[PDB]
Amino acid sequence: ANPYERGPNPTESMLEARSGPFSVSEERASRFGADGFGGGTIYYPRENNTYGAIAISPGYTGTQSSIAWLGERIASHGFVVIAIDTNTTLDQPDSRARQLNAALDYMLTDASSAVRNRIDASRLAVMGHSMGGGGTLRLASQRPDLKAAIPLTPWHLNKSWRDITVPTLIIGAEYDTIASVTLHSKPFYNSIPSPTDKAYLELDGASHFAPNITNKTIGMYSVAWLKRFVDEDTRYTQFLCPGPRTGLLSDVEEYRSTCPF
Numbered sequence: 001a002n003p004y005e006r007g008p009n010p011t012e013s014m015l016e017a018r019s020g021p022f023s024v025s026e027e028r029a030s031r032f033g034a035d036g037f038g039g040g041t042i043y044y045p046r047e048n049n050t051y052g053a054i055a056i057s058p059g060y061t062g063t064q065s066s067i068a069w070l071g072e073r074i075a076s077h078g079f080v081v082i083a084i085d086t087n088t089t090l091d092q093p094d095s096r097a098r099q100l101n102a103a104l105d106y107m108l109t110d111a112s113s114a115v116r117n118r119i120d121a122s123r124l125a126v127m128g129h130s131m132g133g134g135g136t137l138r139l140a141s142q143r144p145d146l147k148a149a150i151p152l153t154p155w156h157l158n159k160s161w162r163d164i165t166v167p168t169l170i171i172g173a174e175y176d177t178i179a180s181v182t183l184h185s186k187p188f189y190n191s192i193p194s195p196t197d198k199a200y201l202e203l204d205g206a207s208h209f210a211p212n213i214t215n216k217t218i219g220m221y222s223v224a225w226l227k228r229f230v231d232e233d234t235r236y237t238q239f240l241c242p243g244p245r246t247g248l249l250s251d252v253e254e255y256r257s258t259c260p261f
Ligand SMILES: CCOC(=O)[C@@H](C)O
Pocket: 058, 059, 060, 061, 062, 063, 066, 129, 130, 131, 178, 208, 212
């Protein structure tokens, strides 16, 4: 048995629902007590166990409320998740990366015992929107010990992520005019070296701001990716390989992966 497996056996329906099988509580990390970032809200399962821990960054102009739905959603599938605020809302991607790292360290030793007792410190991941997705790529590049990375409509000036060894799912938006997939997501995905496990999922019809409102496709595939890689849960492989149907009527415009993993 996998010592990391949590929760009931998955179904597509369960993954698309507004809330997973775990009840979520919240702990507020204030700006002034949080070293190296602007504070945040830690969402965690009420059910006592150890879980993987995830930090999620907003983008330029955004705050924790811009990604809170997704932090809660993910925690409700059995994860400890911090949705951060940055030191300033104008912070650039690589500052965002440092702040994501500080938020992981915060959960591990500065949060309450309720939070720390629910984390397996060895199983960590990072996510983020837009410049926060650029920050996710950078942290993934600098921390190969991470179990997963999920950049959402990522923006970064650096196009080549040739040193990422962390399993990375990049979620792009078809009609993004701020971080165009042509200039941002795709080059990033193409550059992640073999044999790193990876996937690219482009949301049909979507704008740059699709990650800031509840989105069943982002919720389903973010959880499936974290389950597979943070929890070594092979019950989730079914959703990722061969992956979503694409094509004219799909919510997924395009899907690439290195399946089987
Ligand atoms: C809500 C965050 O908005 C962004 O990150 C845009 C400006 O990239």
